[PDB]
C-alpha cells in the first residue's frame, strides 16, 4: 500500500 510506502520512506 502507499501507506506502507510512506512508512518505509519515512
Amino acid at each position, epitope marked *: *500500500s*502507499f*501507506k506502507e510506502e*510512506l512508512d518505509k*520512506y*519515512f
Partner: antibody
Amino acid sequence: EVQLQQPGPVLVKPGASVRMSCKASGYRITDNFMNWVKQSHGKSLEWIGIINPYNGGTKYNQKFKGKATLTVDTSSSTAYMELNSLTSEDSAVYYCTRVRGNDYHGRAMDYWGQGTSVTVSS
Amino acid sequence: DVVLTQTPLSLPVNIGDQASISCKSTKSLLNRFTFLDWYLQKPGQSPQLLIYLVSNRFSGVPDRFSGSGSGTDFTLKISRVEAEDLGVYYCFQSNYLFTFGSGTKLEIKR
C-alpha cells in the same frame, strides 16, 4: 530562529518551465523532510510532494508526477521545485514547508515559507 | 485519494462562544500513532500548525484550541472564540497520500 525563505511573486509564460527556491535558515536542511504545497486562489490546499534533503529521495502526489520535480542543494541549504509545461491552471501560491519527522512529531508541517505566487500569463 | 470532509464549511460564531469543526475521513488514519493535523490560515498569512497527532498543541498555540478523535472521526474545538481567531481551518492527514480538507471559514458574527 528557523526560517524558510522563498522568492516573491513571479510572472512566467505559458508553456515555459519555472524553478522556484526555498532557502532554509536556522537549522540543518538535511535534518528534516520538506513538503511542497500548492494553494489555488487563496482557498484550496494541495500537497505536491516530499523530499528527503539528505537522500534526495522524493515522493509525489500522483497528480503532480511529471509536472513537478523536487531537488535540493545541500551545500547552499536550498530546496527547489521545478514546474514544467506551464498553463494557467498553474497560477497559484507554492509553499515550501519543514516536516518535523515521523511518529512523535506527527509528520506535521511546523515551519512554512511565505510562498511564491506564480502568475502564468503571456 | 482519502477525502477529509469537514463540517461545517462556514462557521459563524459570537466572540466568547464555542466553535466546533468536524473532520471525517474515508479511511482510518491510524498508523500504529494517528497522523491527523489541524492548520489555520489567517487572512494574508501562510498556513500555520495548530494541532498535530490528533491532540497535541503545537508551540505557542493557546489552550483554547483542542483536538480530539480517533479512526476516521476528529474534532477541533475553540473553547472561547476571539476576534483574531478568524481564518480558514484545515484538517490534514499524512497516513496515505497527503490530503487536506476543504477548509472551514471561521467568521465572527457581531
